[PDB]
């Protein structure tokens, strides 16, 4: 028998659903999302990392001109300076203080750290959902763990579970991702082969170990200071090492809907977004026939105290007479009141106690114990806490509706003004009637 | 949970007060001033003898 229902996508809140099968005693499932995971499909556009600039010993040609030979190295730059006269430690390197040249050349490469200090720029196409769920079935807890794609049925304790997909396909990731160790960022990174100096992507490579490098660091060689053998240059410093100081907050800290984020593989987790369909094909062996369960009568429901406190801040005692000993399901027919207990043991003429949670300032609600449907009301005190460390276990309130018993001033003014309007209309109608009957 | 009340300043007479907290059975406290002691702060001007 396939029951089907929608739970909110809120993780860590248990939800109660009523399996009211025709001609059988009613069955009640508690179910809780333990974690919902969205994992995007990742295509690597490129790695970025710190570059090393490679500068071999400058070739100082004494007594004549060297010349540049162009070569295909990643940001190769080369220059010939004329009229140098360099000194080593022991004396001048050249016979004459004129006609000499220095050929200075450089390029850039990946550092050898690019195997471990790199950020990966990814494209994040779309995300496969997964859910882990606890269900209270035949009075005991069981955990189910299934892809939330609306397929991939999972069987446990002879029930078959099919879960998702969610009402909202939202995800915290933009189409463009960058990740660095534990952190992932919604960065619109530059195209491969089109990154700019001193910014994220000033050096790029297709994979950490790829032989290729794109580099655009604006490396400019400069004329050496007189008397020395050095190679001075101007270059924009590593845009990766600047990005690491200027990142801002990872999605782990900034994402909407309270979600967590993790990065091996990359997942969003526990987003409070939309709602989730769930369906449960439970066996006929789970049910019991409507006459084999306790049948209840002469029921009365009393409410010792109520507070609308998010935490089952109200408690109710139900007095009853019941035909036989056994377990029996309990459910609430009013959406503004959630009861903690899914089932109870019942016998004789006695009483049962249930703990309940609500937003209502006067909790009027209808409770069902095996097809027997008692009514009660309560007057609720507000809590003293101001704020709490757990989400509301009650359903939210339609703020205009379900207003208090003892709001009846609304009926006193609507009735009283309604009578004054009705009297004035009746008087106008009778004087209209006689003055029309005079024509 | 804070409760506040005013008892008359009469020594040796026991006063009842009711802590009528929601969700709990109401708690009754009895209290009685055993003494009240107005010591003045007190500055010497002189001895006579």
Alpha carbon A177 to its chain centroid, in Å, reads 16
User: What single-letter DSSP state applies at residue A83?
Assistant: S
Report yes or no: B8 at the A interface, CB cutoff 8 Å: no
Residues of chain A found within 8 Å of residue B24, distances taken between Cβ atoms:
305
Inter-residue contact A225 to A234 (CB < 8 Å): no
- The overall longest dimension of chain A from CA atoms, in Å, is 139
Q: What dihedral angle (degrees, nearest 10) is formed by the CA atoms of A382, A383, A384, A390? A: -150
Residues of chain A found within 8 Å of residue B23, distances taken between Cβ atoms:
305, 307, 313, 381
Residue A135's Cβ-side half-sphere holds a number of Cα atoms within 13 Å equal to 25
Task: Name the phi and psi angles at A211, rounded to 5.
Answer: -70, -30
How many angstroms separate the CA atoms of A318 and A16, rounded?
20
Inter-residue contact A243 to A119 (CB < 8 Å): yes
How many angstroms separate the CA atoms of A230 and A223, rounded?
9
Report yes or no: B22 at the A interface, CB cutoff 8 Å: yes
Chain B: residue nearest A308 by CA? Answer: B23
Write down the experimental method used for this entry.
Answer: cryo-EM
Residues of chain B found within 8 Å of residue A311, distances taken between Cβ atoms:
none
Nearest CA among A170, A130, A174 for reference residue A39: A130
How many angstroms separate the CA atoms of A162 and A282, rounded?
11
Chain A: residue nearest B21 by CA? Answer: A381
Nearest CA among A291, A251, A289 for reference residue A271: A251
| Share of chain B residues as helix, strand and coil, in percent rounded to the nearest 5 | 0, 25, 75
Chain B: residue nearest A313 by CA? Answer: B23
3-state secondary structure A150-163: CCCCEEECCEEEEE
| CB burial string A114-138: b at 16+ within 10 A, e below | beebbbbbbebeebebbbbbebbbe
Token pair recorded at residue A201: 């992507």
How many angstroms separate the CA atoms of A8 and A278, rounded?
10
Please give the interface size between A and B, counted as residue pairs whose CB atoms are below 8 Å apart.
Answer: 9
């Amino acid at each position: 028998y396939e029951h089907v229902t929608v739970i909110p996508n809120t993780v860590g809140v248990p939800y109660k659903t009523l399996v009211n099968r025709p001609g059988y005693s009613p069955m009640v499932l508690e179910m809780e999302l333990l974690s919902v995971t969205l994992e995007p499909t990742l295509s690597l556009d490129y790695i970025t990392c710190e570059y090393k600039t490679v500068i071999p010993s400058p070739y100082v040609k004494c007594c004549g001109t060297a010349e540049c030979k162009d070569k295909s190295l990643p940001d190769y730059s080369c220059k010939v300076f004329t009229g140098v006269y360099p000194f080593m430690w022991g004396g001048a390197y050249c016979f004459c203080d004129t006609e000499n040249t220095q050929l200075s050349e450089a390029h850039v490469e990946k550092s050898e750290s690019c195997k471990t200090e790199f950020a990966s720029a990814y494209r994040a196409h779309t995300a496969s959902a997964s859910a882990k769920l606890r269900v209270l079935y035949q009075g005991n807890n069981v955990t189910v763990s299934a892809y939330a794609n609306g397929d991939h049925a999972v069987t446990v304790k002879d029930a078959k579970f099919i879960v998702g997909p969610m009402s909202s396909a939202w995800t915290p990731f933009d189409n463009k991702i960058v990740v660095y160790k534990g952190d992932v960022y919604n960065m619109d990174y530059p195209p491969f082969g089109a990154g700019r100096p001193g910014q994220f992507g000033d050096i790029q490579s297709r994979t950490p170990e790829s032989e290729d490098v794109y580099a655009n660091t604006q490396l400019v060689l400069q004329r050496p200071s007189a008397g020395t053998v050095h190679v001075p240059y101007s270059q924009a410093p590593s845009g990766f090492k600047y990005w690491l100081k200027e990142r801002g907050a990872s999605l782990q800290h900034t994402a909407p809907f309270g979600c967590q984020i993790a990065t091996n593989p990359v997942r969003a987790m526990n987003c409070a977004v939309g709602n989730m369909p769930i369906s449960i094909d439970i066996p006929d062996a789970a049910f019991t026939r409507v006459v084999d369960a306790p049948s209840l009568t002469d029921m009365s429901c009393e409410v010792p105290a109520c507070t609308h406190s998010s935490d089952f801040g109200g408690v109710a005692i139900i007095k009853y007479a019941a035909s036989k000993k056994g377990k029996c399901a309990v459910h609430s027919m009013t959406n503004a009141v959630t009861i903690r207990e899914a089932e109870i043991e019942v016998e004789g003429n006695s009483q049962l106690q249930i703990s309940f949670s609500t937003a209502l300032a006067s909790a009027e609600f209808r409770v069902q114990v095996c097809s027997t449907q008692v009514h009660c009301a309560a007057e609720c005190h507000p809590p003293k806490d101001h704020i709490v460390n757990y989400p509301a276990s009650h359903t939210t309130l339609g703020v205009q509706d379900i207003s208090v018993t003892a709001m009846s001033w609304v009926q006193k003014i609507t009735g009283g003004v309604g009578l004054v309007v009705a009297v004035a209309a009746l008087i106008l109608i009778v004087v209209l009637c006689v003055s029309f009957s005079r024509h």
